[PDB]
Amino acid sequence: SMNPPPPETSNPNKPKRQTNQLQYLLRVVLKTLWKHQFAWPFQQPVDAVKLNLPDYYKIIKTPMDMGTIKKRLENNYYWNAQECIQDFNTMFTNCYIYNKPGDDIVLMAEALEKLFLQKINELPTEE
Ligand SMILES: CCOC(=O)Nc1cc(-c2ccc(C)c(NS(C)(=O)=O)c2)nn2c(C)nnc12
Incomplete structure (x- = not known):
């Protein structure tokens, strides 16, 4: 049964915060990387079935x-x-x-990571 369940994205008992740094991560970092010409293979979990990568x-x-x-x-x-x-x-x-x-x-x-590191360098101070 080749793909595992995906990572958890919901867990009501896990304690959560909204911080200005997490807001930056969504509104600046994620937004920028997501719209990049190279983002598409990274926009959902690796589909080992679809790609015939039974070793992934x-x-x-x-x-x-x-x-x-x-x-x-x-x-x-x-x-x-x-x-x-x-x-x-x-x-x-x-x-x-x-x-x-x-x-x-x-x-x-590598191209996404360079961009990521550029943006993380400007991560705002925790208010
Ligand atoms: C020995 C051949 O190695 C590989 O083909 N490697 C990788 C390939 C792809 C990849 C390609 C094409 C498509 C259509 C997709 N779609 S998806 C997200 O639904 O799976 C993903 N992602 N990838 C990621 C991340 N990390 N490694 C790989």
Whole structure:
């Protein structure tokens, strides 16, 4: 049964906050990366069935994607900005683990990550 269940995006008993940093993560970081020409393979979980990659989820045990991140930000899933930043980093790292240097998907990930790092550098102070 080739795809795992997707990451959780809803959990009513998990404590949540709305912080100005989490707002920036949705309105600046996510928005910018989402509309990028290279965003599309990252906008939902890797579909190992569709791609015929039966080894994907043998290799990647902590999957993450921007579709998941978008839903987490829109539905106020997080306690802090660092949880969300960790999700972006997991997404990029997984890509580098599974694939090889110079593969198209890696080039795409690198371009998104450069942008991500540019925006995270301007993360607002926690008010
Ligand atoms: C040895 C071949 O390796 C790969 O094909 N690698 C990867 C491929 C794709 C990828 C391509 C095309 C499409 C249509 C999709 N769609 S989706 C999100 O529904 O699965 C994803 N994403 N990807 C991500 C992230 N990380 N690695 C890969």
